């Protein structure tokens, strides 16, 4: 009946930590290089009678993410080519794609070029016929290493020792909450860090029903994030078989311009199986209705953000949803949707610099899993009458949310005080 | 077994049988192959780790109880702390509500248990003849 | 926590009657629920007890053909408490099963008395009559 203290080393408490976590990859500059080789079997430890707090939302492993994304990206743009020089006056002509002589610097510095490359319309715009890149007269501009490759490959986050990653296993989670059934790991699955505006890509895929997650359904300003229990396909093709031009600028410097077309005179797009979608769009405006319908397009402006932006192959396509979204709900054949492309991007310009895409040799083809989505809502109308939800893709944060909104981090307090019926012995 | 962190929803005694695990797999070593921001990252974790470890070695030391796991004190449980009986604790509470019941006075007692190390020591000074 | 069981029913005798057990402010999955009455010819009887987590149930004998309990999956509140739901189901209905009747949570997770009734509701009337 008389309790002393005894200190307990290694007792099961955690507490919420963000911390500076780390990559693991093991198969491309970004993760290729990464870090320490993924274990060969990864230990996913079931905790029974466990419910524990989530917060996609609220979450840190988004923010360390988007930071190591944007630094890689960097990182790797920083050794190759800046095309500088490269916004010499050009004098252009028809073959929206246009034919463009130019001067450029030789090898010797007093020699001089006139050489001609193939621009999309995106890239130039006209001054006072004389031509200019549309980045020369905001920002400078460098030009993507050809070896590097923009495709993503796996990357697993993982806590250091004496923290734990705790992962929600529970089917029919909300994007927040208590979770019933958690699990720890060291690391997460595979997580392709998919560069994606609207719909998502290559994402991971919701068991049992498809999940509707935002952090308020009722507040506009707030996205609405899709994940599909039943992934739909979509197969996104350049049918133009374009050719790379090496041209040398200096010394070691070299200008990969744009051939002459070789094939069709078609843009590039991509189908998707109309019943496939069908099918899909009727789960999602199901678990619309859970909370409650037309869908229309965005249209504001950015053409980078209205439009579904993504990279395949090398080429930074931005896609027309148009097909997509024209429909009202009250409860093969597949559609296809043109895509531009554009080789000059600025995702952030003003905290940096810009990128040239180089031109791709050949037709280019990739097949997608489409996995989610990102919605937005209007305006509020008159209540309850009609809703109307327009597809977008603002943020990238939200594709890591998309992914890590199972995940979440804590750090170990094995330190633990309780009382038992114990003393020391007398000295 | 369970596993690390098997027993979080357990009952405080049967966590408290198989502490051991947490305890073990609580310090790691992930090799290396960085020879980046990715070095730096993993460099800066690498500290943290075994920093906690060693700050949780040293308060185990300063009460005596640099062997680990288990051990007993001087220290009488006041009964301002906590009010249940052992069965409760032992029996109905898991450790984390637990440490959420007494988190407002951890560290009284952490300071009580030097105190009372330091006392003892100071005995085993004066215990010769 | 609060247990709150439904409120009271009037059933003829030989029919059947389903009392309810709506739980808050513990973990549900915890703790056994038991099922007791009390009459006022007989007094106090234990009927029997049911884990939400497992679903293993225990009948006293006198009701083990004629009773049937169930319980659902806890629904999360924070982390440390959750509600839940447990039914009883008594058929054949006599004159002397006119009581009041409890559903009661458990005392301790681990021990010599878990399933040991320490929380309990407000209890439903059973009323048999014509």
């Known amino acids: 009946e008389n309790l002393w203290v005894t200190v307990y080393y290694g007792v099961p408490v955690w507490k919420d930590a963000e911390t500076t976590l780390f990559c693991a990859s093991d198969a491309n500059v970004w993760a290729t290089h990464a870090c320490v080789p993924t274990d060969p079997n990864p230990q996913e430890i079931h905790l029974e009678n466990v419910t524990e707090e989530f917060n996609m939302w609220k979450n840190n492993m988004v923010e360390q993410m988007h930071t190591d994304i944007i630094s890689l990206w960097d990182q790797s743009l920083k050794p190759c080519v800046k095309l500088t020089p490269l916004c010499v006056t050009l004098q252009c002509t028809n073959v929206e794609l246009k034919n463009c002589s130019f001067n450029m610097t030789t090898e010797l510095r007093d020699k001089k070029q006139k050489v001609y490359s193939l621009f999309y319309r995106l890239d130039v715009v006209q001054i006072n016929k004389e031509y200019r890149l549309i980045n020369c007269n905001t920002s400078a501009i460098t030009q993507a290493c050809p070896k590097v490759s923009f495709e993503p490959i796996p990357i697993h986050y993982c806590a250091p020792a004496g923290f734990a990653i705790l992962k929600c296993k529970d089917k029919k989670f909300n994007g927040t909450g208590p979770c019933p059934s958690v699990s720890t790991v060291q690391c997460t699955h595979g997580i392709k860090p998919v560069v994606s505006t609207q719909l998502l890509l290559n994402g991971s895929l919701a068991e049992e029903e498809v999940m509707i997650r935002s952090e308020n359904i009722t507040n506009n300003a707030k996205n609405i994030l899709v994940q599909f229990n039943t992934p739909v396909q979509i197969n996104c093709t350049r049918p133009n078989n374009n050719t790379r031009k090496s041209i040398r600028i200096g010394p070691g410097q070299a200008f990969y311009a744009t051939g002459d077309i070789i094939g069709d005179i078609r843009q590039a797009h991509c189908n998707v199986s109309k019943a496939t979608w069908n099918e899909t769009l009727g789960k999602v405006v199901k678990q619309l209705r859970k909370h409650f319908i037309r869908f229309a397009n965005s249209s504001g402006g950015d053409l980078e953000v209205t439009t579904h932006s993504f990279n395949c192959g090398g080429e930074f396509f931005y896609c027309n949803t148009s097909g997509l979204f024209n429909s009202t709900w009250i409860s093969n054949d597949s559609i296809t949707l043109p895509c531009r492309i554009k080789q000059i991007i600025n995702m952030w310009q003003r905290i940096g610099q810009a990128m040239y895409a180089p031109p791709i040799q050949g037709v280019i083809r990739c097949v997608s899993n489409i996995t989610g989505l990102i919605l937005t809502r209007d305006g509020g109308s008159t209540n309850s009458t009609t809703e109307t939800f327009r597809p977008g893709g603002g943020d990238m944060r939200d594709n890591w949310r998309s992914e890590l909104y199972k995940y979440k981090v804590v750090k170990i307090e094995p330190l633990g005080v309780a009382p038992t019926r114990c003393k020391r012995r007398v000295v | 077994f369970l596993g690390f962190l098997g027993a979080a929803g357990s009952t405080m005694g049967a966590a408290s049988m198989t502490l051991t695990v947490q305890a073990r797999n609580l310090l790691s070593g992930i090799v290396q192959q960085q020879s980046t921001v990715w070095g730096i990252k993993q460099l800066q974790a690498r500290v943290l780790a075994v920093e906690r470890y060693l700050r949780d070695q040293q308060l185990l030391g300063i009460w005596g109880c640099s062997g680990k796991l288990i051990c007993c004190t001087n220290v009488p449980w006041n009964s301002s702390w906590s009010n249940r009986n052992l069965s409760e604790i032992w029996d109905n509470m898991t450790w984390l509500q637990w440490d959420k019941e007494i988190s407002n006075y951890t560290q009284i007692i952490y300071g009580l248990l030097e105190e009372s190390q330091n006392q003892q020591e100071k005995n085993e000074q004066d215990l010769l003849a | 926590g609060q247990l709150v069981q439904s409120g009271a029913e009037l059933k003829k005798p030989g029919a059947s009657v389903k009392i309810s057990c709506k739980t808050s402010?513990?973990?549900?999955?915890?703790?056994?629920i038991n099922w007791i009455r009390q009459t006022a010819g007989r007094g106090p009887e234990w009927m029997g007890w049911?884990?939400?987590?497992?679903?293993?149930?225990?009948?006293?004998?006198?009701?083990?053909?004629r009773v049937i309990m169930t319980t659902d999956t806890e629904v999360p509140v924070t982390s440390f408490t959750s509600t839940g739901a447990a039914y009883m189901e008594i058929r054949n209905l006599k004159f002397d099963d006119t009581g009041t009747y409890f559903c009661?949570?458990?005392?301790?997770?681990?021990?010599?008395?878990?399933?040991?009734?320490?929380?309990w509701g407000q209890g439903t009337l059973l009323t048999v009559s014509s």
């Open positions: 009661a949570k458990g005392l301790l997770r681990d021990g010599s008395s878990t399933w040991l009734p320490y929380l």
């Open positions: 049911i884990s939400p987590y497992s679903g293993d149930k225990n009948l006293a004998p006198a009701f083990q053909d």
């Open positions: 402010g513990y973990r549900f999955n915890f703790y056994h």
